[PDB]
Design an enzyme around this catalytic site. Structure first.
Site, PDB file in Angstrom:
ATOM      1  N   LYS A   1       0.841  -1.186   0.000  1.00  9.72           N
ATOM      2  CA  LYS A   1       0.000   0.000   0.000  1.00  9.72           C
ATOM      3  C   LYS A   1       0.880   1.240   0.000  1.00  9.72           C
ATOM      4  CE  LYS A   1      -1.542   2.851   3.109  1.00  9.72           C
ATOM      5  NZ  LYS A   1      -1.965   4.066   2.359  1.00  9.72           N
TER       6      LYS A   1
ATOM      7  N   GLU B   1      10.146   2.892  11.055  1.00 11.43           N
ATOM      8  CA  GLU B   1      10.695   4.053  10.369  1.00 11.43           C
ATOM      9  C   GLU B   1      10.274   5.321  11.094  1.00 11.43           C
ATOM     10  OE1 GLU B   1      12.323   5.875   8.274  1.00 11.43           O
ATOM     11  OE2 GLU B   1      13.733   4.271   7.764  1.00 11.43           O
TER      12      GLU B   1
ATOM     13  N   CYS C   1      12.963  13.015   7.069  1.00  8.01           N
ATOM     14  CA  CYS C   1      12.976  12.683   8.487  1.00  8.01           C
ATOM     15  C   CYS C   1      14.289  13.111   9.151  1.00  8.01           C
ATOM     16  CB  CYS C   1      12.708  11.189   8.678  1.00  8.01           C
ATOM     17  SG  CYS C   1      11.120  10.635   7.990  1.00  8.01           S
TER      18      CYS C   1
ATOM     19  N   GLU D   1       8.625  17.414  15.401  1.00  8.70           N
ATOM     20  CA  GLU D   1       8.946  17.424  13.980  1.00  8.70           C
ATOM     21  C   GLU D   1       7.880  18.170  13.186  1.00  8.70           C
ATOM     22  OE1 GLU D   1       8.548  13.727  11.850  1.00  8.70           O
ATOM     23  OE2 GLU D   1      10.348  14.143  10.660  1.00  8.70           O
TER      24      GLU D   1
END
Ligand SMILES: [Mg+2]
Lengths: 452, 454
Positions: A171, A244, A278, A378
């Site tokens: 996906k 992740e 990231c 973040e």
């Protein structure tokens, strides 16, 4: 030139989704709808997982040479699709045309080349005494991939799984499905065996959740946000989970630095991919003595950042991926202002003439206290938070106070200082002075007394 | 005599728990309580985790020969404590004396020896081009260890963490804390630096949960049941702690038709009754060819009769009791569930053997004519219960062997070598054993510094 992607790729062919609903894919630069994909459901997942499950033993025991040959076909056909891939990434992601080809397109090709080449010397079998140790595919693997680099994580995991002999159900982000669709077309054309690759478009609720819950998925590989990362639904089935992570990455500037170079480097870490990475350098640590001079050069560098249409020549920075994501960036900027962080440059709103499409303004906050929201959390946008430090141990202490362990950076002259900083920062990756996966899908079995 | 273990080992000293409550430890063979440990709380955990957090940077950067010498001191002192360890294991676990010495004690010693030796040459730093790649201690690590081999997973993880330079907070099974207490005594005697090792006794609610939820614990290593495993791994999803779970299984033992019948019965019986059938790798599903079925069962009946169940301190006892009342009941519930479903009771049955009504003693039990879809086929019993499932063609055997929710272990016994190889390769398990033939990385993480040498 609309793209109708609404079909799912399941069991060796494009099939209509069990769902009657679609998701509009939007060009982040023009805000217009460039196409649509299925909004997928559990039924799609179950059909795809079953198809993968039917072939997994067959794929696992496919010879290494045979799997390497398949990867070579993929390498060739991927190159055939180069222009299609570059156009798709630019359109869906908003990445500048030049970065679409040289970064995004190249990443994908590299992963497939590397996986194919690895199979030359990779040892799946080793004899120890009378015992034989083997490595085999873990079997059916779910894959959920990020929008920020649609070719990167996707190609990486697919190449590894194919090299390992694990069939997959993928996906992609519903935000950037087009590159994944092309990969499916590629796989279909080179004829990766029926059931080995499956593509199910949709969102977390319709697709992501059921895939992570499916009892016949033995491996789950996810890339994306923290909350979605929470791994809780895969702990019931005891699936192997690959994390992740997002991050707030400190960039430490030494007081001996060439100031223009530091300004260039730190601007680059924040501004690249419109700051959605990231590993981005969004926390910049600066010495008090060089603070004013650095900020001056920094302001200069930001003013020269080219933010606009990705298809237009010269554009360095494209739009934010989506309305929702654009809103989050705005909210974080607004929050920093509410906190009393002094806004140095840019700030909320869109650049003049850029009112169409989601365009964040590269933004610098100064005099930031590390406990502030823009320091701690973040943002995922081109927002830099500048934090001053009097001594190096303080800078290290600041750089190390974060929830994220992902990455770190340091720039300066003196070697031992650079090395002390680099070794002191706790992160998986630290970069000094802008210096330029198959195991995951494998399981080890030891057979005792094989040879005797 | 009664052991008072109620003190925790935290920050380099035996300390009173913050809790006012204790947990009784029971001898599985006699049913009497042989001692007490603290029933620990979040406060004990926080003190231990903080003590570890204070020292973790120093221990990470301590030298290889320093850690190796520490392990060497441990190896020596561990040998000094050999009798204490053997008695403790026998008392708390209910393992036979010979097994406690020959297996349980030896395991732990080997683990510390392996870790010490592995540091002789191990590369923590590698230059690649202009980049430096280093393996460093992950930092503070929680450890939750099982009762079935009290010195095994405990010693394995502790040795690995010490070799890697990671400080730990250990919660042993409150069923079998004594071995862990002894390890602590050893660590304290050889002078493991304070904060590096911490022992917090308690149960899942008071200790295990706060430990697994602690933001300063960077890694969680767990061995035990499935239900608790999912529970702890779910609590570690918020902090994204590195998690290592080690769990039980249903391990098929495939018997070939060319096998020696007596040795087949001997092999399969051993895999079932060892440690009173509480082993994660136990051979609880035995697949037999339809043609040799009657002859195999007859010899299987004979072999089970030779199995000596009873007092662990009695000479020649092969099999001790089940660890606890709670676990003993579970075994009973499964044996009954087999009967309820229509599995055919062949040898043994529910209840305790005649002559031990005291202690939790399960009778070694064989079920035949078992269908693989039955509960006793599909679920780990953790007792000396064997399910015999017949097959016709080898393809059927592999199919049945591999229809399980578990990937842990597998066994094949036979003669023809090509047949053995195929079966061995076909069984999906981490460990496959043909004809009864005979770490530190977990606590390390990789950091690459780009342009270090540039
Ligand atoms: Mg006990």
């Amino acid at each position: 030139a609309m793209r109708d992607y609404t079909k799912q790729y399941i069991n060796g062919e494009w099939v209509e989704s069990n769902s009657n609903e679609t998701i509009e894919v939007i060009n982040p630069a023009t805000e217009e709808v460039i196409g649509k994909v299925a909004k997928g459901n559990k039924a799609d997942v179950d059909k795809a997982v079953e198809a993968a499950d039917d072939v997994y033993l067959e794929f696992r025991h496919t010879s290494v040479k045979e799997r390497q040959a398949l990867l070579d076909k993929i390498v060739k056909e991927y190159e055939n699709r180069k222009d299609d891939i570059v156009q798709a990434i630019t359109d869906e992601l908003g990445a500048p045309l030049s970065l679409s080809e040289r970064v995004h397109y190249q990443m994908g090709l590299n992963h497939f080349v590397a996986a194919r080449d690895a199979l030359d010397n990779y040892e799946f079998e080793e004899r120890r005494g009378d015992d034989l140790v083997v490595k085999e595919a873990i079997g059916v693997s779910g894959l959920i991939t990020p929008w920020n680099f649609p070719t990167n994580q996707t190609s990486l995991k697919l190449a590894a799984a194919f090299a390992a002999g694990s069939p997959v159900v993928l996906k992609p982000s519903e935000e950037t499905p087009f590159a994944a669709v092309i990969l499916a077309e590629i796989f279909d054309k080179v004829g990766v065996p029926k059931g080995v690759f499956n593509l199910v478009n949709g969102d977390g609720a319709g697709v992501g959740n059921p895939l992570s819950e499916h009892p016949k998925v033995r491996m789950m590989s996810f890339t994306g946000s923290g909350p979605t990362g929470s791994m809780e639904k895969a702990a019931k089935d005891f699936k192997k989970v690959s994390l992740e992570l997002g991050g707030k990455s400190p960039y430490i500037v030494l007081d001996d630095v060439d100031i223009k170079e530091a300004a260039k480097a730190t601007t680059g870490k924040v501004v690249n991919n419109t700051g959605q990475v990231c590993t981005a350098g969004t926390r910049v640590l600066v010495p008090n003595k060089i603070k004013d001079a650095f900020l001056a050069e920094l302001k200069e560098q930001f003013s020269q950042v080219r933010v606009g249409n990705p298809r237009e020549d010269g554009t360095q920075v494209g739009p934010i991926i989506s309305k929702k994501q654009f809103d989050q960036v705005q909210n974080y900027i607004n929050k920093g202002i509410e906190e009393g962080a002094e806004l140095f440059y840019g700030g909320p709103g869109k650049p003049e003439g850029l009112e169409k499409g989601y365009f964040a303004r590269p933004t610098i906050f100064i005099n930031v206290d590390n406990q502030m929201t823009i320091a701690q959390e973040e943002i995922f946008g081109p927002v830099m938070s500048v934090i001053t430090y009097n001594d190096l141990d303080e800078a290290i202490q600041i750089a190390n106070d974060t929830k994220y362990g992902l990455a770190g950076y340091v720039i300066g002259k003196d070697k031992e200082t650079l090395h002390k900083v680099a070794r002191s920062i706790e992160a998986g990756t630290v970069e000094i002075n802008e210096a330029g996966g198959i195991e995951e899908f494998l399981e080890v079995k030891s057979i005792a007394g094989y040879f005797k």
